[PDB]
């Protein structure tokens, strides 16, 4: 069986990785100005439909950071 991430598993990873960073499903990757014809895909069609890498979860994670003692 293939290894994919869908449902709570997908949301769990984003929440477990990004957490309070605020992950986004739709984000640029190639070019959204010169190319007109383009389908809608981000983390679902990329990892749910196809087998991706967990490292991608970090990309969606925002640059901001919550509060912590240091």
């Amino acid at each position: 069986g293939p290894e994919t991430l869908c449902g709570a598993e997908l949301v769990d990873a984003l929440q477990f990785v990004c957490g309070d960073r605020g992950f986004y499903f739709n984000k640029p990757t190639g070019y959204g100005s010169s190319s007109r014809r383009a389908p809608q895909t981000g983390i679902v069609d990329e990892c749910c439909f196809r087998s991706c890498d967990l490292r991608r979860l970090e990309m969606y994670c925002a640059p901001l950071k919550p509060a912590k003692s240091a």
């Binding site: 290894e3 991430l5 990873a13 967990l54």
Partner: peptide, 16 residues
């Protein structure tokens, strides 16, 4: 070991 290796690793890592 590394958590970001497979789809299963993520579950085991979190579900602990």
């Amino acid at each position: 070991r590394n958590c970001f290796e497979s789809v299963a690793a993520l579950r085991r890592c979190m579900y602990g």
